[PDB]
Amino acid sequence: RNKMTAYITELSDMVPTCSAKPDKLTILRMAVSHMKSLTDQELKHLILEAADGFLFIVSCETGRVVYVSDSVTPVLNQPQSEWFGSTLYDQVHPDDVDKLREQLSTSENMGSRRSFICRMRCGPHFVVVHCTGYIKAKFCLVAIGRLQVPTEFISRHNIEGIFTFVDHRCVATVGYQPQELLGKNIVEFCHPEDQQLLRDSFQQVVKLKGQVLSVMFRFRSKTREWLWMRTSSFTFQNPYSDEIEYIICTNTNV
Amino acid sequence: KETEVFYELAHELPSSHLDKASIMRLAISFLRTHKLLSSVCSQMDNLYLKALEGFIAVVTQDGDMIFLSENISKFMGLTQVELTGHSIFDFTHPCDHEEIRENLTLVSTERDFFMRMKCTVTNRGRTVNLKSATWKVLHCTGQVRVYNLSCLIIMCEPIQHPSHMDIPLDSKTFLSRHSMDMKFTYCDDRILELIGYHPEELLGRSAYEFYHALDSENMTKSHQNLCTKGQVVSGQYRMLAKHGGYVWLETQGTVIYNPRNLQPQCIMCVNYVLSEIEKNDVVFSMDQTE
Numbered sequence: 087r088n089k090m091t092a093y094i095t096e097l098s099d100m101v102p103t104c105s106a107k108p109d110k111l112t113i114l115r116m117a118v119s120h121m122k123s124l125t126d127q128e129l130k131h132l133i134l135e136a137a138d139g140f141l142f143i144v145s146c147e148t149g150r151v152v153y154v155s156d157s158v159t160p161v162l163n164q165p166q167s168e169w170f171g172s173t174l175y176d177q178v179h180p181d182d183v184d185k186l187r188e189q190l191s192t193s194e195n196m197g198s199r200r201s202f203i204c205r206m207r208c209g210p211h212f213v214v215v216h217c218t219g220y221i222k223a224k225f226c227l228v229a230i231g232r233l234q235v236p237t238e239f240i241s242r243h244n245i246e247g248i249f250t251f252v253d254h255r256c257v258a259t260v261g262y263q264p265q266e267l268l269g270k271n272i273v274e275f276c277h278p279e280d281q282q283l284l285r286d287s288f289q290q291v292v293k294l295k296g297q298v299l300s301v302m303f304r305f306r307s308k309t310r311e312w313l314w315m316r317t318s319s320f321t322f323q324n325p326y327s328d329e330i331e332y333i334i335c336t337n338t339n340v
Numbered sequence: 341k342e343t344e345v346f347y348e349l350a351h352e353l354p355s356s357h358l359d360k361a362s363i364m365r366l367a368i369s370f371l372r373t374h375k376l377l378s379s380v381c382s383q384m385d386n387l388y389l390k391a392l393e394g395f396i397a398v399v400t401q402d403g404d405m406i407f408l409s410e411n412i413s414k415f416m417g418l419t420q421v422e423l424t425g426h427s428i429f430d431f432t433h434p435c436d437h438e439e440i441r442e443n444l445t446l447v448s449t450e451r452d453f454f455m456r457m458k459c460t461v462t463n464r465g466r467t468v469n470l471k472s473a474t475w476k477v478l479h480c481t482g483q484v485r486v487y488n489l490s491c492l493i494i495m496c497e498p499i500q501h502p503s504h505m506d507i508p509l510d511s512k513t514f515l516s517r518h519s520m521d522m523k524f525t526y527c528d529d530r531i532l533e534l535i536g537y538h539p540e541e542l543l544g545r546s547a548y549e550f551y552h553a554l555d556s557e558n559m560t561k562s563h564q565n566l567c568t569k570g571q572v573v574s575g576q577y578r579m580l581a582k583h584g585g586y587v588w589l590e591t592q593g594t595v596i597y598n599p600r601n602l603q604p605q606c607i608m609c610v611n612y613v614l615s616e617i618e619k620n621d622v623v624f625s626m627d628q629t630e
């Protein structure tokens with residue numbers, strides 16, 4: 087009984103002209119009148135609010151869009167004048183048309199559904215868009231496309247200390263091409279005076295699993311220069327087995 | 341004499357077989373949702389709903405599901421009428437509740453998470469009573485919005501099970517099997533045409549050695565989700581290509597269970613190739629050095 091009374095008072099609050107307390111039999115009739123006094127676009131608004139998506143109907147034959155909603159402007163910063171009168175291939179990264187051809191094909195898949203990711207041009211700037219839709223009536227695609235969320239270089243090593251991954255910024259920081267660091271141990275590029283130090287660091291990073299340790303040593307550049315370098319390093323662990331996949335270092339000059 | 345106005349409320353409710361408490365619940369939830377919609381804002385609803393691969397959920401800061409789109413049954417079996425007005429915690433996995441709470445409160449308003457919701461529909465398409473309800477992982481993406489009270493407006497998409505695929509897969513997609521270690525145990529031939537690796541030279545290899553380091557934080561996160569809830573959708577990441585460069589990738593991971601001993605057997609991954617090989621002139625790992 088308490089919950090039905092609470093429902094009655096809540097419905098009394100939700101009706102304006104009623105809050106301005108008429109029974110319950112009366113309260114329901116006031117609510118019915120308020121319902122009679124009052125859709126579809128309310129779904130477009132919730133969808134744009136939740137996923138930053140816009141609806142579009144294109145043609146499965148030529149790709150020409152038969153309808154684009156105004157929601158394409160807050161999503162892609164493009165007016166309906168651009169989309170309308172064009173085809174989806176013109177609004178898509180040139181390396182996706184093949185994919186698009188496979189999705190806009192109705193040779194085997196009607197009323198079938200479609201789900202695919204593609205790069206759409208916005209504002210040349212492209213944004214990743216997840217498109218989910220279905221085939222309709224020759225045939226059209228009704229879909230919704232939604233959006234979604236040098237001083238150093240990163241490197242990966244094995245337990246020994248051998249470069250197994252090098253990010254390109256090394257070319258600017260130490261001068262070597264990535265192929266020149268890959269395959270060789272990091273101790274090889276270290277000043278001998280400092281080598282032991284570096285080794286001790288690589289001996290502790292593994293024994294201090296997951297923790298970050300910072301060593302500093304002289305790195306031999308391609309120009310044969312002793313650049314002082316601060317390497318912060320930690321071991322990466324497999325989330326399921328806790329086994330050490332590799333040692334991740336952030337080699338920073340100065 | 342009795343009251344038939346209760347039937348008139350269900351008729352003007354945008355109905356017949358409902359108890360009085362349910363009609364109250366639906367009316368009050370509709371009015372609150374309309375208040376929020378007047379807050380956000382200043383036929384084609386069929387197209388907008390049929391084109392969705394998920395359902396819209398407007399949930400208050402206290403967990404009250406004040407709005408659910410009509411297609412929710414199509415993904416969850418539980419209908420719009422059965423759930424509207426009820427707490428989300430009464431229909432989600434307890435181990436996710438706290439996470440749900442963290443996404444319901446509060447400077448940024450974007451929300452992107454994975455929750456486990458009750459599901460009474462089977463892969464056959466039949467609907468099942470509420471007592472036997474499996475857990476379905478929903479990728480929920482949306483916004484927290486303060487209105488005059490705070491709500492969470494999210495789109496909740498299920499992650500298609502790799503066995504039962506209703507969506508046509510284009511040539512830019514390929515499958516890969518993994519252990520819970522994420523080491524490769526099987527891969528499609530298409531990878532050779534898409535990234536350049538032979539499906540055999542990848543077996544027994546840890547997938548953590550083949551993606552660009554800058555994406556690690558993403559991957560591990562996904563992995564944990566994939567091990568905690570059974571399914572996950574990764575962000576956009578880079579897998580290092582065979583002969584230098586990398587390829588952009590988004591994969592849907594699903595933990596497969598052995599139907600006989602009910603044990604986690606493997607992880608199937610549906611990898612969507614998002615681009616051609618980028619920076620193919622640059623080598624990144626030792627595996628790229630032939």
Ligand SMILES: O=S1(=O)N=C(Nc2cccc(F)c2N2CCCC2)c2c(F)cccc21
Nearest residue numbers: 516547550551559562563574579591593609
């Ligand atoms: O580039 S990859 O070597 N990294 C892959 N995935 C991966 C790696 C580490 C942790 C993880 F959680 C994952 N997942 C992504 C979501 C499912 C699990 C992957 C893949 F799934 C297929 C092909 C090539 C690759």
